[PDB]
Amino acid sequence: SIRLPAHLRLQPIYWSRDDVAQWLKWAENEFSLRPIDSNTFEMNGKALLLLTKEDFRYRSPHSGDELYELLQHILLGKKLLEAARAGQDDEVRILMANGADVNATDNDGYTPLHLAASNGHLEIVEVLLKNGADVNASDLTGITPLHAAAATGHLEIVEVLLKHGADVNAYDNDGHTPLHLAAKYGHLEIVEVLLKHGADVNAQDKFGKTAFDISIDNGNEDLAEILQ
């Protein structure tokens, strides 16, 4: 599969010169390509998109087409991220049928399964889990799709995640578990199903607060009483 370094996962329309340069450098090692002068592609990412494959070919008689098609590949990863967010089930099909890597990542570590579980698109989450989307991938803040699905209240999505291997005791960079965010947003039934599949109700975050305490600070006392 294909995975940009952390500094290149942004949309290429947003790349600077140096990003474009870092991308060329990166591509040269990954795919095992002959070293070229980056001043050939002397332009920011917004201009790179305007180039034709021939323009790629004549700049790099030895790797121009591969870089053109490589670029095209990452570009579909963004349209897949977008197709999984807006709920565009058809667009998710065409892109996965044209080769979309179902574990792409943007600048925020979001995968297409993160966005489809955070926004409530049950069909996309299932067709992503069926074609190999990582169920326990964590973004740069550590939020898993079960974090996003439990923080937003999507019960049928929290349950489908638990059915394919979603970790119920995953800790984020701030220490929060899926039972913490379900308590933060007042979703008792998700706290129920989380507590059914093995959620450590006594998990502590980096400030020392439990699911009871988050239910206290946010105003969910009926939930705070059920955890007590």
Numbering used by the authors: 13 to 240
Quoted from the paper:
A point mutation of the TELSAM motif causes it to be soluble at pH ⪆ 8 and to polymerize into well-ordered helical polymers at pH ⪅ 8. Target proteins can be genetically fused to TELSAM, which promotes crystallization by ordering many copies of the target protein along ordered TELSAM polymers, which associate to form the crystal. To address these challenges, we designed multiple constructs with several types of linkers—rigid (helical fusion), semi-flexible (Pro-Alan), and flexible (poly-Gly)—of varying lengths to fuse a designed ankyrin repeat protein (DARPin) to the TELSAM C-terminus.
The ‘3-fold’ lattice featured more crystal contacts, showed higher internal order, and achiever a higher resolution compared to the ‘2-fold’ lattice. Analysis of this structure revealed three key interaction points stabilizing the crystal lattice. The total interface area was 307 Å2. The weaker nature of these limited interactions also likely contributed to the lower resolution achieved in this construct. While rigid linkers eliminate the rate-limiting target protein docking step otherwise required for polymer-polymer association and crystal growth, they may also hinder the formation of optimal crystal contacts, contributing to the formation of lower-quality crystals and reduced resolution. Rigidly fused target proteins have no opportunity to sample multiple binding modes in search of a binding mode that gives productive crystal contacts and so exhibit a lower (but non-zero) probability of forming strong polymer-polymer contacts.
